[PDB]
Amino acid sequence: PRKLQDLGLKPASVDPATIKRQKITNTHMTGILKDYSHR
Amino acid sequence: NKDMCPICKTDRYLSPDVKFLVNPECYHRICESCVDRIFSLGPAQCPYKGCDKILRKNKFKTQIFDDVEVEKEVDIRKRVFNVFNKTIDDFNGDLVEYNKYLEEVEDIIYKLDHGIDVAKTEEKLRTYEEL
Amino acid sequence: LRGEKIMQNDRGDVIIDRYLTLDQEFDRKDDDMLLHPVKKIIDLDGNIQDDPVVRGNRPDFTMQPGVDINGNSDGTVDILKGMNRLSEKMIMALKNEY
Amino acid sequence: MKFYIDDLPVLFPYPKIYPEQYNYMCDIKKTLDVGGNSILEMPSGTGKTVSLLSLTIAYQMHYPEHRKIIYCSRTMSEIEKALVELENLMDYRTKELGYQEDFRGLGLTSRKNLCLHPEVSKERKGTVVDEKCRRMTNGQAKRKLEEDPEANVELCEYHENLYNIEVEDYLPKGVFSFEKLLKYCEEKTLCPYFIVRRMISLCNIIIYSYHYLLDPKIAERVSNEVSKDSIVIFDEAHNIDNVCIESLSLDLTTDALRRATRGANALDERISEVRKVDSQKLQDEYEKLVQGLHSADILTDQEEPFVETPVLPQDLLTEAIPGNIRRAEHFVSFLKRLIEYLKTRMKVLHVISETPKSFLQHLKQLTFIERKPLRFCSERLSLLVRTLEVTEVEDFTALKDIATFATLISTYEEGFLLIIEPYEIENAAVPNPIMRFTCLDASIAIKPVFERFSSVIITSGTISPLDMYPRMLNFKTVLQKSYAMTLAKKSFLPMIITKGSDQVAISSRFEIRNDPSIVRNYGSMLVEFAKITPDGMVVFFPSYLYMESIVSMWQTMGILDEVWKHKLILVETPDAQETSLALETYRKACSNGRGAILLSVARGKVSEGIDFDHQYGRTVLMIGIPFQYTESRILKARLEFMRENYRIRENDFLSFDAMRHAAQCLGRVLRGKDDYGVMVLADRRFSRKRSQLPKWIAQGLSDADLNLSTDMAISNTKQFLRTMAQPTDPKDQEGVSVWSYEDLIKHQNSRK
Ligand code: SF4
Ligand SMILES: [Zn+2]
Ligand SMILES: [Zn+2]
Known part of the structure; x- marks a missing residue:
């Protein structure tokens, strides 16, 4: 070239x-809370 | 005969640096490489089919106009004006005489351009340059 | 028909697309149906033809229909004409034989 | 009514008269009596044309000078309106004086708008119509038919029938508008265009556009017939500088030059063939040229030059042909090399701005073309085309542009510039070089008018400030003033909106044209105002490209869907016929109560004569200041020239140019004093331009409305419409805004 x-x-x-190459405090709710981390 | 040298057929795509020159003798397009290769040693016949007029390398120049006919006419006009050069004061303000003189100059230029009377017109130019 | 710019990316439907050229022809026919002489009071054609030998400076690109790099129309004028024709068709349909 | 001025009786065509109209007539009479020019600004809501016609006609019919009247408008629709007003006035005068006084009043326009030939009036361009009419009326066809009846050349029956009757009997005494004239000429098989062109010298009042007075191409022939002592009226003359500048401006494109080369070659071939077969024509033309005759002495009155004189008559040389272009072949070679020089100059890689002197010097260097032979290009080409028997001139149409450019550049050197731009459109894959010959001084075209005519009235509804016009155009005025309408109750509500309902600033700057917040704010304003506007709503955009882009964005967002529920949408289009049909549809929708909204360009075809009054115009949305394109070489050169010569700042002139068009659009809302409307200027930059608006609008613009919000403006609009919907008390306007004959007499007695 x-x-x-x-x-x-x-x-x-x-x-x-x-x-270029490129101590949880409450546990009776465990398994219930979905992770609505963002909105 | 669009963007390549008619002799060596060097296309601009393969030779972007190619530059075409012209010669007043016959106004035939030719590339600088052909000019250098054919005329470096000395004068030679034009490398064209049907053209047998010798020319010199030093006479080559760059084309100004894109029309060969207008280039020819303008060059002949320059040659004529280098000899027939007068102003309005040359006739003491006689506009009729000045107009007739301009008409005569234009007729001479036309005759040179179209080859009407080459011998007589050239002889008249040669005489008038003396006078 | 909704007066929205058609996107080449959109796939559309093969069957319905066959009628697009027929729609172009129908639009031409409707343009002829609506065209008629206009009163001199609001005749804009006469405004531009008042002096037929006007030669000035061509208007800037802001005063001309939008164009793309290739030089062809961007198509935004087509939707304007479509909505204009829709309004004209409604108003004309008001003045029916009844 | 019929009242009296100091010594002039004037008959008004209405039983009532406005104080503004009376003061306007008094000022116009004072100007006419004292001599000189004057500048008058009358409110758009008060009858201006009727007052002008009444006073001027009374003056002409009363005083012994009997000075004729020339009325110059900006558009043909305005000519039609003025003719209708004149017809109404003459009807009133005929009913009051007991007889039809000797009077003839006609309008004037091009062939395209007055042609009745079934095969020549069906063209989409006026140049072709003119060429065909010339083919039918030049006299070549008549002479050929006379010599040999078998010739297939046909004539125009309308033109031929005129020879039977005399000029004085072309039309009956009275006022003939375009509509009535077309009807009469169709019923009698006559040509209205030729009727007007042959009766201009006899009519008492002649009405035409500013092009027929400023453009030398069509102005010389018409001006040679009008009188020198006639009154001159410039109606709606606020945008006369643009006309004066475009009169002497040319643009040449690569396609134009490529077509000019073909035309030159065709001309050379034609010369060769005529040389072969019939050369006595060439010999005769050359003999006539030798003596020093010109187109005026060679061409007959029936025929016209092929190339219209592009320069003013005063700047044309009176000397014989220089001699270089005396012969056909010599002139052809000269023209061919001129075209070649233009082509080789069209290859520049960056913008070049040069003076005509520099262009001529470079031409004289590269080629051997002198200034004097160049000055005669158009005249010589006209004579040559006339003598070459070129009945079909499609090939030679191109040479007209070259002749025009040559005769202009070799004629003018001060106030003119030549701009060569490699990019006509910067948004283009391939360069498209363009050569523009631009006139920077707007006074060059109008100087002959102001010198030839003694008294000139410049009247308008939105001509302000009045001080700049004498500065821009070199003329002096005996008086220049603007009238304040004596409204009893506010009838128009002007307001300025600087931000949307969200308190975000709104502007129409091109660099931020595609901004979601601004576009959505404008769309919300449009929808909210359309919801409350009863019948009609006109929106004016700074430029057609901006209107297109913003309308497409609104279509994507769905705002147009909301508008459609309440009103029809009509959009201005480049096609003039389509725009006219859109206007008709908008008027019908406003009349039938369906409700309509019209989108147009503030500097477009609608704003230059179309008027929205009563039901047609209720709300006017000026979306942004109609600023010109700043990054324009022509505009930048004009601004620099004005700064250097007239000491006018670039920002001041730009603001004036934009505010003038904004006011022009604003003033098309009111016809009488019973008309009302809301005028919203939607841009943050209007807040400081109140002092630049016309006086009658600035007085009505309150201090609390200088910077409003969309919601607050909607509330104010609702309240204002509700207030204006109530019956007016007759006593509140009995003698404070509308005057009867007794009130007028009382005013005269108190003043005296
Ligand atoms: S003479 Fe009149 S009617 Fe005949 S072609 Fe010309 S403009 Fe048209
Ligand atoms: Zn070669
Ligand atoms: Zn050769």
Whole structure:
């Protein structure tokens, strides 16, 4: 791709090196409370 | 004959740096690479089918207008105006004479452009440059 | 028909989509049905044709219908025309033979 | 009634007269008697046209000078309204004086609006109609038919029938509006356009638009017929600067140049063929050119030049042809290389603003085109096209733009600029270069009028401040004032809304056009006001693009669904016919009680003449200040020119331009003093523009309404409508806002 760009021709690819990889208190209620953590 | 040199057929896509020059002798488009390869040593016949007029590398220039006919007319106009150059005061304000002179100059330019009387017109230019 | 911009992403229905071109033709026919000479009091065509040789500065892009990168219409004018035609059709239907 | 001024008897067409109307007539008479120009601002709710016509007609028919009258409006619909008013006034005068006094009053417009030919009136553009009418009336067809009856060329029966009768017997004495004129000319197979064009020099009063007085293309022929001592009236003249500027402005596109090249090649081929077969025409034209004759001396009165004179008549050179373009072929080559130079200049990569002198110098350098030959391009092309027998001119239509641009740029150098932009539309994949030749000084086009005519009245309903107009256009006024309507009870409620019901600021700034909070606030305001508005509701948007985007957002949100339950929705569209049909539908919906809402552009076609009164206009929502597009090269150059020359600040001029259109839209709500309406200006930026509004609107704008909320404005609107729905006490307006003859006599006695 670098040579193709140097010669003025659009390169349709990129260098792979640039691809960035990417004591509970009450218990009688146990098993009853659903976790409404967010709203 | 759209975006490639008719001789070497160098397309702009493969040669984005290609630049086409023109020669007043025959106004035939040619790329700088062909000019350098064919005329570096010295003058040579134009590399075209049907054109046998010799030309020199030093005479090449960049095309201004996109129309070859208008480029030819404008260049001939420049050559003529370099010889027939007068102002209104040259005739002491005689507008009739100035208009007739301008008409004569335009007729000469037209004759040179269309090859009506090449020999006589060129001889007249040569004489008037002296006078 | 609801006057909402159609989205290419929406799948729609294959059977009903066959009538879209027929709807275009029906819209043309309804435009002809509604078109008629207008009184000179509110004749806007005469306002623009009063001087047919007017040449000035072309209006800015804010004074022209919206367009996209490719240069074609964005389609927002179509819904405006659709609602306008709906209102015109209702008003005309009021003035029936009865 | 029939009352008396110091020495002038005036017959009013109504038994009652407003104090504002009486004072307006007195001021106009004073201006006419003293000589010079004047600026008058009359409230939109008081009869202005009727007073103007009454006073001017009485003046002309009483004094021995018998000065004619020229009425200049901004639109053809206004011409129609003025003609109707004049007809009513003349009917009253004929009923009161016992006879029909010798009087002729006509309007004037283009062929497209007065053509009756069944095959030529069916065109969508006026240029084609004009070209076909020229093909039928130039005299070429008549001459060919005379020489050889077998010729297939046909004529126009309407035009031919006119030759039988004389000019003085074209129409009977009286006032002919466009509708009545079309009916009469259809019943007698006559051409109204030619009737008017041949009777202008004889009519007592002539009514036309500002283009027929400012645009040199169509103004020279009409102005050569009117008298020099006539009265001149400019009605609704607050937006005359835009007309004056667009009169001398041109735009050239890449497509235009590409078409001009083809036209030039076709012209060269035509010249070659005529040279081959019939060259005596070329020889005769050249011989006539040598002496120094021009289009005026060559063309007959029946025919017209192919290219309309783009410059004012005073700026045209009177000398013979320079000689470079004396021959057909030489001129063709000159024009071809001019087109090539334009094409090669259209390749710039960044905005370039240059003066005509710089453009001419660069032209003289690259090519060898001088200023003087360029100044004669249009005239020479007109003569050439006339002599080449070019009955079909579709190919040559392109050369008109090049001739216009050449004759303008080689003529004017001060107050003009040339802008070359690689991007006509910045939102485009591929560059589309555009070349705009713009006039920056608005006084160049109007100087000849102000010098030719002695007395000029500039009257309007929303022309304020009055001090800037003399500054912008170089003229002096004997008096300039605005009238305060003597309303007995407030009839219009102007209010400014700066924030929505949620107390969030609202504005129509383009950079924040797509903002959910602002869009939703505007939609809520629209729905709430539509719920309380009885019959009609006009919404004016700053620009068509803004209206489109905000309407689409409302459609997505479902606000339009809420509006639909209470009122029909009519939307302004680019198509003029569709917009007219929308207006008709809106009026029908307002009349039948269904209730309607009309969305339009504050600077669009509706606001330039369409008037909403009584049932048609009840509430006016000005959505944002109608500010122009700031990032415009033409507007920026005009602002810089005004700052340098007239010492007008850019912000001041921009605010004036926007407030002028806002007031223009606001003033289309009231016809009489019994009309009422609510005028809401929905933008945080109106709060400081009260001093810039017209006097009669500023007086009605209370201090408590400078910055309101949507809910509080809705409550005020409900209360105001409920109050205005009650019967008025006759005594409250018996002699304080409406005057009878006895009250007028009492006022005159007290004043004297
Ligand atoms: S002469 Fe009148 S009716 Fe005939 S084509 Fe011309 S404008 Fe139309
Ligand atoms: Zn080559
Ligand atoms: Zn060659």
